[PDB]
RNA sequence: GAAACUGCGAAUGGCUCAUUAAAUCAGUUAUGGUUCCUUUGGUCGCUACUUGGAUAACUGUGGUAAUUCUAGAGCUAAUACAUGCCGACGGCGCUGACUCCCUUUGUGUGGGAUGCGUGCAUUUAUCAGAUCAAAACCAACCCGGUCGCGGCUUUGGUGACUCUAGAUAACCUCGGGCCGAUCGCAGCCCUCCGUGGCGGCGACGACCCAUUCGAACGUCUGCCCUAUCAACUUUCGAUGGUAGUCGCCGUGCCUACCAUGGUGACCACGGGUGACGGGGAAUCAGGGUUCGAUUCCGGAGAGGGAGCCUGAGAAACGGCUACCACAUCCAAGGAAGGCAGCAGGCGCGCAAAUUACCCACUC
RNA sequence: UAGAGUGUUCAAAGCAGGCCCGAGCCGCCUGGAUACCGCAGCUAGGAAUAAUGGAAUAGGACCGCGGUUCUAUUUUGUUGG
C-alpha cells in the first residue's frame, strides 16, 4: 500500500540504494482522515495488536477549557479561521490539531454569571430583567457577601476576552488529534497567544 | 434450566468477592500499622540529629 | 529577545502557563514568563545562559524535550551553515594487520547545537551525547563546547 | 521465513550447562515460556531423565508428570518443559525427597537434596520498586512474583525470604559491603564470597568485587550478584565444596589422592 | 459416539541462494521513542431460581459435461450470535432553605433538610510535588497560659523525565472499553423440613500492570575489483527549521511555508562481482594466500511484478484477487494451476541415489 | 580447533564410565575440564617513547580592600506589611 519505510529514499552522500525487500506490513500507510464539521461520524480501524483506533470525520462538539478560571465545558464548534501549516484547510474547513476555531462560549457565560454573580458582555438592561436576574440578586444576606465578596476583587475578565462575548464566539486551539482519538478538545486563547493570532488573522485574510 | 448446581456456582462466585474484600481490609490495616511504626524511628532519628546539633555548635 | 516568534505559529514552552491574576506591580514588572530548564546528569553543569536566556527549541537538551542516553563522543567543529545544527569531524586510525601499520581515516557527523552556546567557531572542540533521532541524519546533541587546545579562540590574556 | 515466534530448539544451539549429548537427535526440549529466562532455566524433562534417571524416554517423563507427583514451589506442575531455575525447590512427595536448584562451582546446576523442614522457604532478589494505584507499594522479584505492601526499607538488589504457601516476605538481607553473595553470571558462575566493594560508573554496568574464603578475589557486574547471607553465614544450605572454584592443578591432586575410580 | 457448529494451530518446521557492497552480517550498545497470542504473579464490590431470534448436522426436492460447486423447503443447540439485572453504597466534596450564641451589619458560632458529581481505564486543561543562614518594628494569632516572649511541619525512583503516585474542573467509543446470563467433581446448617441459607476443589473466559518468548527502529567500528567512473545530490526530497498528516512509537515517513544546504583524493557518485554475511575449511617455519551454495546462527524468495483479507503475529503463496509468461479439462457456455517440501520424470550438462518402511527414539 | 579424563577389542569416533554382596547392597563413587575468541566499545594501574597545552600590550595566590548590581528564602512560632 502506501508506506512509511526509510529504505525507499537516498542517503547523505546523494547516492541511491537498491531495494532490500518487498514492502513489509509493519511499514503500513493508510489515508488521511480530514475531519470536517457536521453531525458526528466516527469510524474505527484495527491496528497492530487489536487496539481499536477511532478515526473521526464530521465532528461538531469539543470539550474546551478556560485555563484562568479552571472551567471546561462541552461546547459547540462554530468554525475554523486560521491554520498554521497549510491555508487551504481553512478554505475547506478541515479540523486538525493546532487549528484555530470559533466556538459558542455560552456555557462559560453561564458559569461565570452563576459563580461570580456579575454580568458579562451584555447589550442593555431590558433583556436581563424578565428572567435571570432572579439569579443575580437573591433572598440571601448571609452567604450573599460572606462568599460573593470572595468573588469580588477577582472578576477582571481581560479586555481582549470581554470584547469577544459581545458576539458570543470565542477563539480556541485544538490540542487533540481528532483522527486518532475521535475527540476534538483543546483550550481557549488567553494572554499573548491571543494578540499573536488576532494579528495573524487580521493580517493574512481580508 | 436452573438446577441446584448453577445456584451453587453463583453462591461461590460471590463468596470469592467477599473473601477478596476481607483480604484487602486485613492487608491494608496491617501494612498501615507497620508503616506508621517506621515513621516513629524516622522522627526519633531526626530528633537525635537536632539534639546533636546542640553539641557540635559549641566553642 | 522579546520578539522570537517568526514562524506561522506561536512558540512557547510547554509545561508552562501564563496566569492572569494579581494585577498590581507598578510602572514595570516581571516579564510575566518563568523559564523551564532541567539537568542532564553525568556531571554536566547546565549553562547559565540556558537558564537566563529566552529562546525556544524543542530539541535543546537543557530546556526542551530530549533525553541523553548511551554513547558519549567528542569531535572538532568543521562547518556551521545549516541553522541550529552543525557538522563535526572525527579522525581515527585503522589498523592494517598484514603490514604492522596504521592508516588515517575520518568521519563527518551532523549534530544539533542549541542557541544556548552562541560563540562557537570552526576549530572548536565539542563534546556531544546521544539522543533519539531528531532528524533524518541527526542523532547527537551538543553537550559542552570548549576551545582548550592550542591556537585558542582568544589571545593569551585570559 | 520468520514472521512469528519460533517454537523449536536445535540440539547444538541449546545451552551448554544442560550437558546434552550430540548424537541422540537434532532437537532439544525448548523450555516453554515461564518465569525464568530461556538460557538460565532447566526444563523439568531434563531434570528427571538426564539427572535423576527416574525416566528413560520422553514419554516416561510425560506419564510421571501426569500423575501429579512433582511440585515446583508447592504448586503441582503438569508441563514437562516447565522452566525451573535458580532458587526453585522441587518436591517429589511419593518418594519423600526434596531438592534446591543452585549452581555447582563449574557453572551448572546439580542435584542438591535438602531437609524437608527447609523446603518451605525460598530466597528472591528484588528487581523493581513502584507505587501502584491509590499509593500501594509493590515489588518484583527475579522469578516474576509481585508482592503487594512490602516493608518500606527493602530496596533494589536486596534479597527476601518468602514462604511458599503465602508469599508474604519474612526476612530480607540488604545489599552492602560485608555480606555473603553467590554469583550468577558470566565467568565467575557459582562462586561465593563477601561483597567487599562496589564501584559505580553512572549509566553503564556498575561493577562489584568479591573475596573467597581463600583470598581469591573476582570482580563481576552488579546485575549478577545474588546475596544469600547476612555475613559469613549463608541462610540456605550449600552444595559440597561451597563455591570455592579450585584450579585444575588442585583438581588433579584430589582426583589422584582420593583415587575416586570406583566405589 | 459418527457428523456438524465452536475453539485453537496452520506465521514454527523444510527447501534453495536469484536478489543485495555501509546493504545483509558481526561484535557493542539504546528504547526515558514502541508492540507483545502464551506461560508465571498481581488486580476482580459503582427475568436474576436466569432474557432474545437463527442457523448447521439430520429429513425431503434439485441444476450443470465438469470442481473440496451449491440453490429451495421442514426441524433444533451454545462458551456461536445479541441483549441485560440483583447485591452492600451507610460514601464524600460542592451546594445552603435555615437556625443558634457573641460582635447590628461586615466579621467571630455549631448544626442543617433540601440538590449535583462521587470505581478502573480513555482525551484535554490546571494545581501542588515542601525542610534551605540568622535578626528588628506593625495586625490576627497556636502552645507553655494569660487580659507583649522562647517552640514546632509532612509518598517512591533515576546519572538524567514533560516518570510514578496525589488534587481539581470536565470529557466518554453506541451498532466502536472493563467489573462472569459458562462447565465438571465432591458436601453441609436450618426460631426446620426443602426452602431459606453456606462450606470445598478445579476447567474456562476477561480489563489493566508486571514477567517470559520475541519483534521493530537506532548508536560506534568493521568489505572484493574498478579512474578506459572526478565531481555527485535538489520541488520528480536532495541537507536543515517551524506546524501538522500518518504510524505501534523516534524520524522528509509525507504535505504547506522557509533557509541553501549535504558528500569527495582519508576515493564521493557510477560500473563489475561464476558476491547471500558470519561461526568456519585447505595449505601453512614466521608472515601469509585461496575458499565458505552446503546440516549452527542472521537475511531473502516461492514463475515475474503488484494489491489485500483474517490474526497477537503475514504484505503469507500447502491463502485470496488482478496483469505478464506458461500449461491442463470442455458438451466451446465455463472451470481449474504453481515440487527452489519428500520420492519420481523431462531438459541441461564433464557433473549428483528409491515414486521403500515407521512414529519406536529427539522434539 | 588446540587440550584434560576415559582399553570403542586398537583407531577414526563417543561422552562416557568405575565398584562389591550368589538375591537379600535392594546400592555406592565419579565425570561431562581448560585455553583461544583479531580489531572497535567498557574498566584500573605504569609514565619510558610519540603527539598536545599554560602568563609577553599579562594574570597566579592571601578572607587584602573601596565602588556597583542582580538575587537567593531561612530565622525572630506561624501567617501577612
Ligand atoms: Mg492486545
Ligand atoms: Mg522458517
Ligand atoms: Mg515470505
Ligand atoms: Mg515446549
Ligand atoms: Mg473447524
Ligand atoms: Mg491462530
Ligand atoms: Mg530481494
Ligand atoms: Mg556499488
Ligand atoms: Mg551495484
Ligand atoms: Mg553501519
Ligand atoms: Mg547482533
Ligand atoms: Mg547492528
Ligand atoms: Mg494456545
Ligand atoms: Mg493471569
Ligand atoms: Mg432452511
Ligand atoms: Mg521538520
Ligand atoms: Mg514532526
Ligand atoms: Mg551545491
Ligand atoms: Mg560543498
Ligand atoms: Mg557505489
Ligand atoms: Mg562469499
Ligand atoms: Mg548471486
Ligand atoms: Mg598457520
Ligand atoms: Mg554459507
Ligand atoms: Mg550459484
Ligand atoms: Mg543442497
Ligand atoms: Mg538457514
Ligand atoms: Mg539479531
Ligand atoms: Mg521453477
Ligand atoms: Mg489467532
Ligand atoms: Mg506473496
Ligand atoms: Mg510455506
Ligand atoms: Mg489456493
Ligand atoms: Mg488462480
Ligand atoms: Mg509447493
Ligand atoms: Mg524434489
Ligand atoms: Mg545425458
Ligand atoms: Mg559424483
Ligand atoms: Mg544426469
Ligand atoms: Mg514421536
Ligand atoms: Mg579435540
Ligand atoms: Mg579421541
Ligand atoms: Mg573470527
Ligand atoms: Mg580490545
Ligand atoms: Mg589509563
Ligand atoms: Mg586583572
Amino acid at each position: 500500500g502506501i508506506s512509511r519505510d526509510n529504505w525507499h529514499k537516498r542517503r547523505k552522500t546523494g547516492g541511491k540504494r537498491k531495494p532490500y525487500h518487498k514492502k513489509r506490513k509493519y511499514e503500513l500507510g493508510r489515508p488521511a482522515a480530514n475531519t470536517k464539521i457536521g453531525p458526528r461520524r466516527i469510524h474505527t480501524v484495527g491496528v497492530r495488536g487489536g487496539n481499536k483506533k477511532y478515526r473521526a470525520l464530521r465532528l461538531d462538539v469539543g470539550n474546551f477549557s478556560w485555563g484562568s478560571e479552571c472551567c471546561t465545558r462541552k461546547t459547540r464548534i462554530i468554525d475554523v479561521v486560521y491554520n498554521a501549516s497549510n491555508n487551504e484547510l481553512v478554505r475547506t474547513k478541515t479540523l486538525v490539531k493546532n487549528c484555530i476555531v470559533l466556538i459558542d462560549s455560552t456555557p462559560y457565560r453561564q458559569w461565570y454569571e452563576s459563580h461570580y454573580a456579575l454580568p458579562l458582555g451584555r447589550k442593555k438592561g431590558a433583556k436581563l430583567t424578565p428572567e435571570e436576574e432572579e439569579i443575580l440578586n437573591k433572598k440571601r444576606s448571609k452567604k450573599i457577601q460572606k462568599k460573593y465578596d470572595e468573588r469580588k476583587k477577582n472578576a477582571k475578565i481581560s479586555s481582549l476576552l470581554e470584547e469577544q462575548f459581545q458576539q458570543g464566539k470565542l477563539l480556541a486551539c485544538i490540542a487533540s488529534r481528532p483522527g486518532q482519538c475521535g475527540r476534538a478538545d483543546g483550550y481557549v486563547l488567553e494572554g499573548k497567544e491571543l494578540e499573536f493570532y488576532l494579528r495573524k488573522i487580521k493580517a493574512r485574510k481580508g | 434450566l436452573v438446577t441446584p448446581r448453577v445456584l451453587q456456582h453463583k453462591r461461590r462466585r460471590i463468596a470469592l468477592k467477599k473473601q477478596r474484600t476481607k483480604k484487602n481490609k486485613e492487608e491494608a490495616a496491617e501494612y498501615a500499622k507497620l508503616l506508621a511504626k517506621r515513621m516513629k524511628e524516622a522522627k526519633e532519628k531526626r530528633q537525635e540529629q537536632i539534639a546533636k546539633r546542640r553539641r557540635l555548635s559549641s566553642l | 529577545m522579546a520578539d522570537i516568534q517568526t514562524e506561522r505559529a506561536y512558540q512557547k514552552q510547554p509545561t508552562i502557563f501564563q496566569n492572569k491574576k494579581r494585577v498590581l506591580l507598578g510602572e514595570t514588572g516581571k516579564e510575566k514568563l518563568p523559564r523551564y530548564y532541567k539537568n542532564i546528569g553525568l556531571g554536566f553543569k547546565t549553562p547559565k545562559e540556558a537558564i537566563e536566556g529566552t529562546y525556544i527549541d524543542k530539541k535543546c537538551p537543557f530546556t526542551g524535550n530530549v533525553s541523553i542516553r548511551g554513547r558519549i563522543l567528542s569531535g572538532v567543529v568543521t562547518k556551521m551553515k545549516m541553522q541550529r545544527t552543525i557538522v563535526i569531524r572525527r579522525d581515527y586510525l585503522h589498523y592494517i594487520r598484514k603490514y604492522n601499520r596504521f592508516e588515517k581515516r575520518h568521519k563527518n557527523m551532523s549534530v544539533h547545537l542549541s542557541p544556548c552556546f552562541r560563540d562557537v567557531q570552526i576549530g572548536d572542540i565539542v563534546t556531544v551525547g546521544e539522543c533519539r533521532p531528531l532528524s533524518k541524519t541527526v542523532r547527537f546533541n551538543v553537550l559542552k563546547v570548549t576551545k582548550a587546545a592550542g591556537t585558542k579562540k582568544q589571545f593569551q590574556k585570559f | 521465513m520468520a514472521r512469528g515466534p519460533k517454537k523449536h530448539l536445535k540440539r547444538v544451539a541449546a545451552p551448554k550447562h544442560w550437558m546434552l549429548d550430540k548424537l541422540t537427535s537434532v532437537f532439544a526440549p525448548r523450555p516453554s515460556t515461564g518465569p525464568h529466562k530461556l538460557r538460565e532455566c532447566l526444563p523439568l524433562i531434563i531434570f528427571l531423565r538426564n539427572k535423576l534417571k527416574y525416566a528413560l524416554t520422553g514419554d516416561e517423563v510425560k506419564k510421571i508428570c501426569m500423575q501429579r507427583f512433582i511440585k515446583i514451589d508447592g504448586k503441582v506442575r503438569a508441563d514437562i518443559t516447565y522452566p525451573a531455575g535458580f532458587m526453585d525447590v522441587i518436591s517429589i512427595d511419593k518418594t519423600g525427597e526434596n531438592f534446591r536448584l543452585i549452581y555447582d562451582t563449574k557453572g551448572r546446576f546439580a542435584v542438591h537434596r535438602i531437609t524437608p523442614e527447609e523446603a518451605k522457604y525460598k530466597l528472591c532478589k528484588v528487581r523493581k520498586i513502584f507505587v501502584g494505584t491509590k499509593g500501594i507499594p509493590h515489588l518484583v522479584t527475579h522469578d516474576a512474583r509481585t508482592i503487594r505492601y512490602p516493608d518500606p526499607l527493602i530496596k533494589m538488589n536486596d534479597t527476601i525470604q518468602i514462604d511458599l504457601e503465602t508469599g508474604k516476605i519474612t526476612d530480607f538481607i540488604k545489599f552492602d559491603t560485608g555480606n555473603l553473595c553467590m554469583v550468577t553470571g558470566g565467568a565467575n558462575l557459582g562462586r561465593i564470597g563477601v561483597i567487599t566493594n562496589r564501584e559505580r560508573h553512572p549509566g553503564s554496568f556498575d561493577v562489584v568485587h568479591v573475596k573467597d574464603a581463600n583470598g581469591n578475589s573476582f570482580a563481576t557486574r552488579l546485575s549478577n550478584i545474588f546475596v544469600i547471607g547476612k555475613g559469613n553465614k549463608p541462610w540456605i544450605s550449600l552444595p559440597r565444596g561451597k563455591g570455592i572454584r579450585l584450579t585444575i592443578a588442585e583438581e588433579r591432586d584430589k582426583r589422584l589422592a582420593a583415587k575416586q575410580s570406583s566405589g
Side-chain angles (χ1 to χ4, degrees), chain D residues 19 21-23 51 106 108 240 255 260-263:
Chain D
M19 271 162 314
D21 68 343
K22 184 186 181 182
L23 297 184
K51 302 297 189 153
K106 286 176 184 269
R108 63 204 192 210
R240 57 184 99 201
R255 183 184 88 82
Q260 48 177 230
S261 277
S262 149

Side-chain angles (χ1 to χ4, degrees), chain A residues 35 40 42 54 56 59-66 71-77 80 95-103 108 171-189:
Chain A
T35 329
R40 259 168 64 179
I42 284 191
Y54 323 103
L59 264 197
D60 192 23
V61 209
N63 173 244
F64 286 109
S65 156
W66 194 1
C71 184
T72 162
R73 252 84 173 140
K74 187 178 161 62
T75 290
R76 203 172 78 86
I77 289 168
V80 274
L95 168 62
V96 318
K97 188 190 193 298
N98 219 266
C99 258
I100 296 289
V101 299
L102 292 174
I103 38 182
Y108 313 112
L171 285 306
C173 149
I174 321 281
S176 294
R177 285 99 71 74
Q180 320 226 120
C181 317
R183 311 164 167 159
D185 317 353
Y187 59 93
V188 67
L189 285 183

Side-chain angles (χ1 to χ4, degrees), chain C residues 120-131:
Chain C
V120 294
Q121 314 277 11
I122 292 163
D124 265 2
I125 319 291
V126 53
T127 277
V128 308
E130 199 185 5
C131 317

Side-chain angles (χ1 to χ4, degrees), chain D residues 39 79 146 250:
Chain D
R39 308 261 131 169
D79 195 2
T146 320
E250 276 268 327

Side-chain angles (χ1 to χ4, degrees), chain A residues 66 104-106 108-109 112 120-122 157 160-170:
Chain A
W66 194 1
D104 66 36
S105 79
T106 281
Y108 313 112
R109 271 218 73 154
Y112 180 86
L120 265 196
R122 293 285 184 175
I157 294 326
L160 301 146
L161 250 165
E162 201 287 299
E163 196 93 16
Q164 286 281 162
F165 293 83
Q166 289 178 351
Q167 302 91 309
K169 302 189 182 197
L170 269 190

Side-chain angles (χ1 to χ4, degrees), chain A residues 66 68-69 111-113 115-121 148-163 165-166 189-191 194, chain C residues 18-24 32:
Chain A
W66 194 1
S68 308
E69 289 76 8
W111 174 84
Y112 180 86
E113 285 193 329
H115 175 236
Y116 281 152
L118 269 196
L120 265 196
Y148 291 167
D149 81 13
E150 310 186 3
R151 317 267 189 281
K152 300 319 173 69
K153 323 265 171 292
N154 315 286
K156 191 37 206 166
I157 294 326
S158 146
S159 327
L160 301 146
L161 250 165
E162 201 287 299
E163 196 93 16
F165 293 83
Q166 289 178 351
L189 285 183
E190 311 281 83
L194 207 25
Chain C
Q18 295 89 331
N19 307 79
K20 277 82 199 171
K21 330 304 312 164
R22 249 296 297 170
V23 51
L24 215 187
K32 290 264 194 56

Side-chain angles (χ1 to χ4, degrees), chain C residues 12 14 74 114 117 123 128:
Chain C
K12 70 187 166 190
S74 103
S114 97
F117 324 100
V128 308

Side-chain angles (χ1 to χ4, degrees), chain D residues 10-253:
Chain D
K10 290 283 176 70
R11 186 153 279 239
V12 198
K16 180 51 218 170
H17 74 81
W18 285 4
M19 271 162 314
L20 271 187
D21 68 343
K22 184 186 181 182
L23 297 184
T24 303
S25 269
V26 309
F27 293 117
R30 178 65 189 215
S32 169
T33 297
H36 267 105
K37 276 169 175 317
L38 198 144
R39 308 261 131 169
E40 285 65 27
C41 56
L42 184 83
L44 225 41
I45 177 186
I46 266 148
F47 191 73
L48 306 198
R49 59 151 192 195
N50 300 139
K51 302 297 189 153
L52 298 185
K53 273 78 178 47
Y54 275 124
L56 291 191
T57 92
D59 272 13
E60 284 191 355
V61 189
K62 168 184 58 54
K63 74 217 304 177
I64 288 179
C65 294
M66 266 299 109
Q67 297 175 73
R68 315 307 211 94
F69 283 128
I70 326 287
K71 280 182 171 190
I72 289 193
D73 310 44
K75 326 254 190 168
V76 179
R77 299 306 181 193
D79 195 2
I80 74 182
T81 77
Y82 185 95
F86 182 79
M87 297 299 107
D88 288 333
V89 280
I90 301 102
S91 267
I92 321 230
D93 286 351
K94 202 54 201 313
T95 38
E97 42 186 61
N98 302 141
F99 304 107
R100 203 168 207 103
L101 295 189
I102 288 182
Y103 302 104
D104 184 24
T105 193
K106 286 176 184 269
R108 63 204 192 210
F109 291 116
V111 302
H112 174 211
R113 310 190 138 78
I114 60 192
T115 168
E117 42 249 30
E118 170 193 338
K120 314 288 232 58
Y121 64 92
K122 80 171 200 155
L123 267 42
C124 278
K125 168 200 180 70
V126 163
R127 281 258 213 263
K128 212 155 86 79
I129 287 286
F130 62 89
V131 184
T133 320
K134 275 147 183 169
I136 320 171
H138 292 246
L139 238 188
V140 188
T141 54
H142 68 76
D143 43 346
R145 301 162 148 274
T146 320
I147 313 297
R148 276 206 329 165
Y149 294 110
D151 174 295
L153 297 129
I154 298 186
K155 321 292 283 187
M156 309 259 304
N157 288 110
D158 275 12
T159 306
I160 55 168
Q161 156 174 358
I162 61 102
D163 294 11
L164 317 179
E165 324 87 327
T166 88
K168 305 317 183 59
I169 71 126
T170 309
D171 290 39
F172 64 96
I173 316 186
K174 175 95 187 192
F175 177 98
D176 75 70
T177 325
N179 305 5
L180 204 77
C181 96
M182 190 178 217
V183 188
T184 58
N188 323 340
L189 179 59
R191 304 185 81 164
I192 305 175
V194 279
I195 304 213
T196 205
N197 225 356
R198 175 253 202 87
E199 310 97 332
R200 42 183 62 261
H201 320 132
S204 326
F205 299 93
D206 324 82
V207 172
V208 161
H209 285 49
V210 203
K211 168 194 169 313
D212 191 6
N214 308 294
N216 303 260
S217 162
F218 45 97
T220 326
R221 286 203 169 136
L222 175 56
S223 64
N224 280 319
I225 296 284
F226 193 109
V227 189
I228 56 143
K230 174 55 193 312
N232 196 249
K233 286 133 211 163
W235 282 6
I236 58 179
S237 57
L238 290 180
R240 57 184 99 201
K242 311 187 193 295
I244 68 191
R245 189 75 158 233
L246 54 80
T247 161
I248 55 173
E250 276 268 327
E251 201 164 7
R252 182 201 65 209
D253 310 351

